[PDB]
Amino acid sequence: SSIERLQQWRKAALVLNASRRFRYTLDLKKEQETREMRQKIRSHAHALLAANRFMDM
């Protein structure tokens, strides 16, 4: 069946694409969480350095 053969091709490509989308979804989460945590720790380090400058004068 010509229609069944072509659908089988499409279904394979869609499954590959779906897997890629699931993965990309994770990569986005991870990059956002990483930036968040980093900016958080950095802002605290800068706060400490600011304090230390007041002690150093």
Binding site: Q8, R10, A12, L14, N17, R23, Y24, L26, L28
Partner: protein, 145 residues
């Protein structure tokens, strides 16, 4: 709103992930499909991917949630880029032609149970220039039809 034919095609792909047929994709089902395709996410990562797609938070991905995932826009996604990426998967040796043996591997990796003759007929169906191989143009024609 997508074509009633698009919807039918998404259901076929969904049904492949949902191997026990209950209408819900679990972390275990997602893991099984990805591993066969040559990926190897940790359980933690599988859970995270389910979580990002699980809109109602009920623990599993239903057809509407899957549909939403497949319909989104992404950024690296110049519709043609997704096609090129799919092609590179089929065309394992990157020589620009999907051979019968290469399609055999994709079908095996998808857990489909096609005979060699069935895969040959798939090649024949998509092959317009009759070289017994599928090039990118041929691939796109089949995909964008």
């Amino acid at each position: 709103q997508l074509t009633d034919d698009q919807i039918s095609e998404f259901k076929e792909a969904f049904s492949l992930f949902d191997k026990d047929g209950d209408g819900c994709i679990t972390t275990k089902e997602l893991g099984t499909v990805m591993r066969s395709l040559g990926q190897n996410p940790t359980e933690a990562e599988l859970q995270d991917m389910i979580n990002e797609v699980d809109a109602d938070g009920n623990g599993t991905i239903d057809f509407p949630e899957f549909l939403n995932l497949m319909a989104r826009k992404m950024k690296d996604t110049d519709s043609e880029e997704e096609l090129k990426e799919a092609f590179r998967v089929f065309d394992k040796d990157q020589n620009g032609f999907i051979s019968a043996a290469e399609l055999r591997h994709v079908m095996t990796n998808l857990g489909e149970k096609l005979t060699d003759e069935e895969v040959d007929e798939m090649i024949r169906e998509a092959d317009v220039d009759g070289d017994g191989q599928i090039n990118y143009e041929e691939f796109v024609k089949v995909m964008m039809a």
